[PDB]
Amino acid sequence: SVKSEYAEAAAVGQEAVAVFNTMKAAFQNGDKEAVAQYLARLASLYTRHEELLNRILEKARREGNKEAVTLMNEFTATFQTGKSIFNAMVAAFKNGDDDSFESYLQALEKVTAKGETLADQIAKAL
Numbered sequence: 063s064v065k066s067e068y069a070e071a072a073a074v075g076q077e078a079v080a081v082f083n084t085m086k087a088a089f090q091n092g093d094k095e096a097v098a099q100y101l102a103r104l105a106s107l108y109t110r111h112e113e114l115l116n117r118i119l120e121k122a123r124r125e126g127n128k129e130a131v132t133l134m135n136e137f138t139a140t141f142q143t144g145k146s147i148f149n150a151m152v153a154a155f156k157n158g159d160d161d162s163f164e165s166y167l168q169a170l171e172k173v174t175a176k177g178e179t180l181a182d183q184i185a186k187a188l
């Protein structure tokens with residue numbers, strides 16, 4: 063069902079949270095080789111999460127589930143904010159700009175924390 067597809071998407075999201083926190087520790091410790099690999103892993107995870115979310119939204123639309131569509135439109139918009147910040151973070155790492163990397167990292171954490179009540183609402187709406 064769409065509900066079980068959202069639970070699968072939620073687990074991919076939690077995987078990115080786990081890898082992100084490990085990446086943050088590596089960055090603080092100066093282990094740039096690890097950071098580079100975690101950033102590659104996160105990019106793939108975010109790509110997979112984004113695709114699952116789009117399929118879920120499209121399915122809610124085909125089902126006529128107006129409330130779930132509203133919430134998923136809001137959630138996918140927030141996802142793109144987080145994705146844009148992530149990409150800026152990757153660029154900061156490439157450029158060796160640790161000040162910008164720190165900035166974007168904290169921003170991504172706050173964008174992600176804010177979006178959590180909506181994430182839970184979607185599970186209940188589908």
Ligand SMILES: O=C1CSc2cc(C(=O)O)ccc2N1
Pocket residue numbers: 143169172173
């Ligand atoms: O979605 C976002 C990304 S930037 C952002 C920055 C800040 C901040 O600098 O406090 C707070 C909330 C925020 N919400």
